[PDB]
Design a protein around this nucleic acid. Structure first.
Lengths: 83, 149, 129, 361
RNA sequence: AAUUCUUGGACCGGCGCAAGACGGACCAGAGCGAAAGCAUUUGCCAAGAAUGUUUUCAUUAAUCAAGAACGAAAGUCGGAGGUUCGAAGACGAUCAGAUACCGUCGUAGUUCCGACCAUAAACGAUGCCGACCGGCGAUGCGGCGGCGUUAUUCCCAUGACCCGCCGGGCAGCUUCCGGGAAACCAAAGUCUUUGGGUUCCGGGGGGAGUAUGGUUGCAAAGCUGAAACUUAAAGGAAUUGA
């Protein structure tokens, strides 16, 4: 390839590229509305949390910090927030 | 590449284009300012306040929710600690290495790594002296460096 | 570290041209680069270009034609007097017919032809031929 | 040992690895236990222990990584002891034990937000316990002798939910939560329980002050549902006046009047109104509506009962009262159902209701 | 073969005892470290790269005379120790001769603690920081996504495989990128189309890393370092012969 459309890359190619090496850099992370099996109130949690996010009143604990993405505990539905 | 290492690590944050605060966030400038005040007065560095906010409360960046940087909020309110929270951490490490090295005398590696950390303390201390964050008399001296926590 | 930004911009154009690419990506854009590339374009060595605008130093995608031989920088930026344009463009440029020395004058950034025209010295940035 | 200048500052260095990966999860309750069996001085082993224990039981619940799996009987009994001791040392200590100025120390920690949302970190312990106890019951073979060995703790639970209820330093307004809890245990206690606290007729038999202590329980639904309903016409949420009334309706069935509980079921008008709540409300509605038809039959109202018990038996998917029924269409959602499923001894028998449609007709 | 050992029972075999060295096979064109270098278990102490990040500070950075830390082996002084091996030396052979190769002994040393010395083919014989310019298959660490296999049998979920993607690292294969005197090198490329930043350093071969002065070390010696005089080649890669 000599001719490549540098201005208009297709989404798959720049979804693949390292987050800094894209044309306009953008994070691979997100925020997610996540709820407990018992309670009704929802909590906003970061994709790569890196803290332990306690359910308000320490009713339980939602996430656990790891290398990359924060592991959400078993029996907690989540809906990733978008803008 | 790293200041005192042969590594060429590419691993840091990537801010999005849109600086606009998203719709789901209901925390206003004064609500997060009350939150930042509470966290700092509990005893917590501008770094640890920032992660607490984005992890638990869902505050993308405080510079967009508020109009200020966390330290400019805290130093305006007068809750900013005197000697900065990177100079602090370099001194704290340097004391921790020297305390180890005073016991384990034949630790030639700890001796070399202590020299590297102290070269980094001097180099950041003089930046803060020029920018008038420290007095011109401020000294890093291992004799009474433990007096600084 | 990146001490000269125009130096790397022109080297990356030069390698892209030699390799036979149709267009190239310049990373840290600046007024001096955009003002260099408009002088190139005005004679017609590069086509159009589009400066991609993030909230940082921008990026430039330049439409290369195959009518550029060499585009090189001169660091350091020497103080070229008007009576020295000849002895600079004698040993930098290939011939007296084609090739240009862009130099930053008080008027703006322009080639040796217009610097002679307006009766002005300045500082050499680079050359393209 | 030192005036909570080392105790509140270790409590935090042991309650920091809570939910971190390499914590082991198991050798943590030990370190939280070696702060009441090593703490043995006044407000230093005796008084501030409210807080050390709040973090001892919260971590004991967190011996289970999953929230869709049941606790084990050893740590379960340990909880039922651990919860009791807090209640007994809290009763004879008329003070708010996460703040609210009393003397000077070791309470009055108003430095942290406000002693309500962690002062009401007592019922969210015993409420989490009540939601835990259902997992023990759902995850046992119902025809086994282990099931009845496990139901022997149904009595142990209802004594603690009574003890936390007697704790009326509320601020009905917001104790409504443990009124819903209390009635959710008693609303289906049968005639032998209901009748045989007065049906030994009141003479020199059972109307003395020391025997009339369990006859409080049948006329308790009326005592408590009245509050939990007529305050939540003002208060916000839906669940703690709709679970409460359906408990009142279901309890006023299976022993008392058809006419009494039809007015309540018509008053609510859920016949056509309950459409857009959650299935864990729409299940106990079905249980109530089935108990309507059974009571009408048992009374001898043998066509208004038939005109009611049609569409349940007409459809083969009548298993909205029991465990999950038929095979496929979404494994992904069939997994969600087997923690919605109602407990065994609560289930009304199904060759009992098949023999109520096909006898009313 | 001999010098050595052995009927005051050597060598071989069994059961124990002590000593001081050393960590085989697993062990790899694998890993870590600024280089020297680093391998049985477990515990304690401080350090570190890479990755992840919608955390924080806001130019704080790159390279560096002066100055400073570490620096294999050998070697010197002091204390402890001395299993193996072994400069010196004692012989036994071979040889024209052997002051060597070979063989039996063997002091210093080899090992540990504390002071020195500061050099190696200390090598990638290749300064560091930054950007750009082909392809392929693997590999070590971190992350991310996906049929399926196997263990936790209850498999949520982790571990062992499988298929791909991203970033740092040790390397490999391949080509008319291009360069080069070539051997060859994706860097030793982007160099008469000569300019990104900066430190050290070379000028035909000898004389000579010698003399002398200075400085460091207890000593050995280290760092800095000429001249007279002699000489037309010395040398590098590759080719064809012998």
């Amino acid at each position: 390839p000599l001719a490549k459309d540098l201005l208009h890359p297709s989404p798959e190619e720049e979804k693949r590229k390292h987050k800094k090496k894209r044309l306009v850099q953008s994070p691979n992370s997100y925020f997610m509305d996540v709820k407990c099996p018992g309670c009704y109130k929802i909590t906003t949690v970061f994709s790569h949390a890196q803290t332990v996010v306690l359910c308000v009143g320490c009713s339980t604990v939602l996430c656990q910090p790891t290398g990359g993405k924060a592991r959400l505990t078993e029996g907690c539905s989540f809906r990733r927030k978008q803008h | 590449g790293r200041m005192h290492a042969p590594g060429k690590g590419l691993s840091q944050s990537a801010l999005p284009y849109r600086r606009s605060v998203p719709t789901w966030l209901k925390l206003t400038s004064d609500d997060v300012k009350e939150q930042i005040y509470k966290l700092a007065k509990k005893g917590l560095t501008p770094s640890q306040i920032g992660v607490i906010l984005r992890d638990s409360h869902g505050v993308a960046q405080v510079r967009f929710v508020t109009g200020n940087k966390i330290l400019r909020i805290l130093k305006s309110k007068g809750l900013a600690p005197d000697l900065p929270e990177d100079l602090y951490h370099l001194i704290k490490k340097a004391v921790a290495v020297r305390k180890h090295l005073e016991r384990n005398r034949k630790d030639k590696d700890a001796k070399f790594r202590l020299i590297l950390i102290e070269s980094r303390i001097h180099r950041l201390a003089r930046y803060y002296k020029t920018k008038r964050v420290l007095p011109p008399n401020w000294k890093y001296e291992s004799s009474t460096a433990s007096a600084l926590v | 570290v990146r001490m000269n930004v125009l130096a790397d911009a022109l080297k990356s154009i030069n390698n892209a041209e030699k390799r036979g690419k149709r267009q190239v990506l310049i990373r840290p854009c600046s007024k001096v680069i955009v003002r260099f590339l408009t002088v190139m374009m005005k004679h017609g060595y590069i086509g159009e270009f589009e400066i991609i605008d993030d909230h940082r130093a921008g990026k430039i995608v330049v439409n290369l034609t195959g009518r550029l031989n060499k585009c090189g920088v001169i660091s350091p930026r020497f103080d070229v007097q008007l009576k020295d344009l000849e002895k600079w463009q004698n040993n930098l440029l290939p011939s007296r017919q084609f090739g240009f020395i862009v130099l930053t004058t008080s008027a703006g950034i322009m080639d040796h032809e217009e610097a002679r025209r307006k009766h002005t010295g300045g500082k050499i940035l680079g050359f393209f031929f | 040992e030192i005036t909570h200048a080392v105790v509140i500052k270790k409590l935090n260095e042991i309650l920091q690895a809570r939910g971190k990966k390499g914590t082991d999860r198991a050798a943590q309750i030990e370190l939280l236990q070696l702060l009441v069996q090593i703490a043995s001085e006044n407000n230093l082993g005796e008084g501030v222990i409210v807080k050390i224990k709040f973090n001892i039981i919260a971590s004991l619940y967190d011996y289970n990584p999953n929230l869709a799996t049941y606790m084990k009987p050893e740590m379960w009994q340990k909880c039922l002891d651990c919860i009791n001791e807090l209640m007994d040392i809290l009763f004879a200590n008329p003070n708010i034990f996460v703040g609210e100025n009393i003397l000077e120390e070791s309470e009055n920690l108003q430095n942290v937000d406000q002693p309500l949302r962690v002062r009401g970190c007592i019922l969210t312990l015993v409420e989490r316990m009540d939601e835990e106890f259902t997992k023990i019951m759902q995850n046992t073979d119902p025809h086994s002798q282990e099931y009845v060995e496990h139901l022997k703790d149904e009595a142990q639970v209802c004594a603690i939910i009574e003890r936390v209820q007697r704790y009326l330093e509320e601020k009905t307004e917001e104790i409504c939560r443990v009124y819903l809890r209390r009635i959710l245990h008693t609303y289906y206690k049968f005639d032998y329980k209901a009748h045989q606290r007065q049906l030994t007729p009141p003479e020199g038999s059972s109307k003395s002050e020391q025997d009339q202590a369990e006859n409080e329980g049948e006329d308790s639904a009326v005592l408590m549902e009245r509050l939990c309903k007529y305050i939540y016409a003002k208060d916000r949420t839906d669940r703690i006046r709709t679970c409460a009334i359906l408990c009142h309706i279901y309890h006023h069935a299976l022993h008392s009047r058809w006419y009494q509980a039809r007015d309540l079921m018509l008053m609510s008008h859920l016949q056509d109104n309950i459409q857009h709540a959650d299935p864990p409300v729409q299940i106990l509605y079905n249980r109530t509506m089935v108990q309507l038809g059974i009571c009408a039959f048992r009374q001898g109202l043998t066509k208004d009962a038939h005109n009611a018990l049609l569409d349940i038996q007409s459809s083969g998917r009548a298993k909205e009262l029991l465990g999950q029924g038929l095979l496929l269409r979404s494994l992904q959602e069939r997994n969600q159902e087997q923690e919605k499923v109602e407990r065994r001894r609560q289930e009304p028998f199904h060759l009992h209701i098949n023999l109520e449609l096909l006898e009313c007709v």
